Paper text:
Omicron variant is characterized by significant mutation in its spike (S) protein, which is a major target of vaccines. In particular, the receptor-binding domain (RBD) of the spike protein has undergone more than 15 amino acid substitutions, altering both the transmissibility and its recognition by the immune system. Two bnAbs, L4.65 and L5.34, showed ultrapotent neutralizing activities (IC50 ≤ 10 ng/mL) against almost all the pseudoviruses tested. L4.65 and L5.34 were mapped to RBD-5 and RBD-2, respectively, the two major antigenic sites of bnAbs elicited by ZF2001.
To explore the molecular basis of their epitopes, we next determined the cryo-EM structures of these two bnAbs in complexed with S-trimer of prototype (resolution 2.65 Å), Omicron BA.2 (resolution 2.75 Å), and BA.4/5 (resolution 2.85 Å), respectively. Notably, an S-trimer bound three pairs of fragments antibody-binding (Fabs) of L4.65 and L5.34 in its open state without steric clash. Three Fab pairs engaged three up RBDs with the same binding mode in different S-timers. L5.34 and L4.65 interact with the inner and outer face of the RBD, respectively. The footprint of L5.34 locates at the typical RBD-2 site towards RBD peak, largely overlapping with the RBM, while the footprint of L4.65 is at the typical RBD-5 site beneath the mesa in the outer face of RBD. Notably, the identification of ultrapotent bnAbs, including L4.65 and L5.34, highlight their potential as therapeutic candidates for the treatment of SARS-CoV-2 and its variants.
Author numbering:
A (entry chain E): 1 to 225
B (entry chain P): 1 to 231
C (entry chain F): 1 to 216
D (entry chain Q): 1 to 215
E (entry chain B): 409 to 556
The structure:
Amino acid sequence: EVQLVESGGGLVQPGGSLRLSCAASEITVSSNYMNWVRQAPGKGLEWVSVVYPGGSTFYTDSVKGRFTISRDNSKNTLYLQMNSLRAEDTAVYYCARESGGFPLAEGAFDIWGQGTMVTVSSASTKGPSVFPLAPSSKSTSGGTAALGCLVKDYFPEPVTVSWNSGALTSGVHTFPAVLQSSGLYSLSSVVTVPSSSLGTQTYICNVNHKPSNTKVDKRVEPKSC
Amino acid sequence: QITLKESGPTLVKPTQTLTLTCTFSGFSLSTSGVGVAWIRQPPGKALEWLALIYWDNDKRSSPSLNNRLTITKDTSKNQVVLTMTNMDPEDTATYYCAHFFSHYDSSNYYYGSWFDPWGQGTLVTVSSASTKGPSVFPLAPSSKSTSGGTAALGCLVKDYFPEPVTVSWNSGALTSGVHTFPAVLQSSGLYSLSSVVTVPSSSLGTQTYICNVNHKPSNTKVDKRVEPKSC
Amino acid sequence: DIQMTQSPSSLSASVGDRVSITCRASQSISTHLHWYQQKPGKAPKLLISAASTLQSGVPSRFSGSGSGTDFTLTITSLQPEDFATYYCQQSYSTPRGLSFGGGTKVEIKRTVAAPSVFIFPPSDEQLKSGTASVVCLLNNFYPREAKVQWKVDNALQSGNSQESVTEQDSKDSTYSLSSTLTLSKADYEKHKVYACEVTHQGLSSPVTKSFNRGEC
Amino acid sequence: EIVLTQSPGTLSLSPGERATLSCRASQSFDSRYLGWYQQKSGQAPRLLIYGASSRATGIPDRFSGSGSGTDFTLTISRLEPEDFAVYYCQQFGDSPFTFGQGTKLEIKRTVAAPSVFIFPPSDEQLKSGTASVVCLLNNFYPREAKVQWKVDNALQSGNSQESVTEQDSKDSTYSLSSTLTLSKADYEKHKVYACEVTHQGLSSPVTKSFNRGEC
Amino acid sequence: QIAPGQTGKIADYNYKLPDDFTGCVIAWNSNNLDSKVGGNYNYLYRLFRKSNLKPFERDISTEIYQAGSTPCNGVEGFNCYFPLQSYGFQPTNGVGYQPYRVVVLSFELLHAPATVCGPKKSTNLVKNKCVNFNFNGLTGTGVLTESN
């Protein structure tokens, strides 16, 4: 039952301190090569820190002087201390085992953790705003129309969008959120439906944000020109 | 300059052991970068490396035949001994012993390694049979008058073991249009070759033709006269 | 300071195909490299160790080869669950020479589908707060390659376009794209016509989508 | 294992033109592990080039090589009749160290019309219980030629042997011998024995037949 | 890594130098001697160990290393491995992965009489002139001449 679980992630203001925990089961942290590797959202992997069974530690150039790695034998845990963080530290951290595997994979990573999210920003956490995107004034257009909702100015991720309280799931596209220049987030949730259904059926747009506890339900109705 | 000569029994019965010895002069098995290689080649097929020995007693053998391969060295007398066990009848080949040296220039860059001069090579045939004398049969020319003034005749040597057989015509007096095909191994572990000489039709009867067969393992020297035969 | 280049950046294949992925190093690293597979939403998994040794618990269809500055991974039959990201990582330099490579993504290959184009002008509700968002949406196109340009009152626009793309859907394996322009009401009231032009390989000619603010 | 393939299988030119050979490796290894050797007829192979980029001691400059990755090539500019032989390519990347199958360099000439001669078993052989009839194809170019043994207009198969000699140093032609061996019961139960030949330079197949009763 | 104050696998679990080391190190490349065309696998190094070695301490223990909670009984497994690993020396390997021969000399001076040290530099012998002389540590001034 070799298992590695990460904990201690979250959002911190720039320049603060943070602590990550890696709990290992069926393996010994004090007797094995342990690693912390961060992956930026959407980017590749990047080694950060390593600790030997004997106690020696290494850190990379961008993190040396600010990142600390330590072990705990009673709890069989690994502790990672972050001092003077920065926005470039926002990533997902994996606790990994080095030089393992059945065939003696020296220096190959066969055991990882589920990862923990570390975010560094000062975007003044707040609630989302929801705007309609009504279909154009068209009769049939081949029996095809598109409508949706635009969610703007929220922080932080995630956010949950639903249509007709779960009555509609087909033809729904929830685009990945994009981080804007002002530090906040925006995205769109669209759906393609036949034109003839635009007048009789009712459409309900629901956007829910847990950190802000904002639950916005509204209606998207076509307008006349 | 270096010399490497092979030696050892060339006639080995099936599923006994075989031992070959290579004697080398012009170099010694104490110089850095100097090794000795043993290679074999079945007749008509490509070469096949067998083993390598280094100056520092390091040994390398073929992974498939490593069960039945052994190599030893004698530095004072400069000999290399190669031993195989449980010989197979399909191992009939020719064996070579070769020098091995790699090139470095004061900086350890290893400009490749090569197989500099090899040995003469000794023929090894593994079969279960007994040496017997060859038999010559006169392949006389067909009863043709001129046929454009060209005909041919000769001898067929059969039932000899082991190789080789030397065939001469008029004690080597004639060398024009003399063809001796390579010997073929029959299914019964037996050999047979042909020696054909071309002569003018008008010269069929004015000159008598003798074909001489020599077989050292059977110590056989037989001369057969060939003359045209009628219907 | 070793860097690795992984080719191709993306490869298109179907079920039952052979896939060859290469990666190259700026210097010879013997065989100190391992190939990993990472699927979206989960940590990477070690597949090949020492660039030639298959790990225990890995399907035998995969294989590795190469030497020095070039390493290759060969897949005979691509099962439907083999669509993920593939990585090669080195451990050559001893002290702190651990570096990572680019990566290759494998996606489902299909025919070519023409995208459908829709437009959403900014609404009055959004214009209440002095912000305007113009949205151009393309649906059901494959492959993902396409280009979108923006025309404000028949003028070229760049540097103010925010684009999002959708991962392949479970039924059609096509992509959905949505571009938006965000502007202030002072700049939006000044102009009259707006448009988005889209050019796609499945489109014989680029498709325009234009709207006049004064008209509607 | 690492497998090296030589292209083409057989390459034949005239003395004077350029000869190109290729050796392809199954896998990828260092270019310094690839070498080429030369073997003549009935003589031990000798070192020719090492490291795939270096000439050996005394090797003429006509021989050159270039290659990388998994493919290498060897180039000869002005070849003389003293280098028509077999060439092997070899690797050192992974044990065991393997040799190429070899490519034979043949001297090219004009097409020659062969002669077919029939030699029935003689009395000295017609008494030991086994008879051998041999028919000879002489002075035929190229090496390719097909011979078929027939007894009483019936095509035999699997009971005959063939032998081909080394290429003539004076005419660049070939000699081929076809032998058919039978016993006394198999010899006296038929009448006429023949062999039929097809050659590239032959307009139509030529059959040489003989009757034992007549002559 | 073969220096005071270093860290690493060799510096910790293979060979550790004291921080007040006296003497020093001579090392040179030996690729032309320690390299084989098929790969030389005759030199081993310890990869797994529980704790760092003391200065001038050697460990020839060849027990199976335990990497988990389950104690194996001498048979290797998923978390039981041999603590020694073979090098991948190859003569074509780049500089940095090539064999190097290393000698470390340590000078010990105890209360016991000093015994090991360098040759004494002597000059020529001149006679019949007032000179400063030093024979075997005996110093003086005067004229040296032949004696009976």
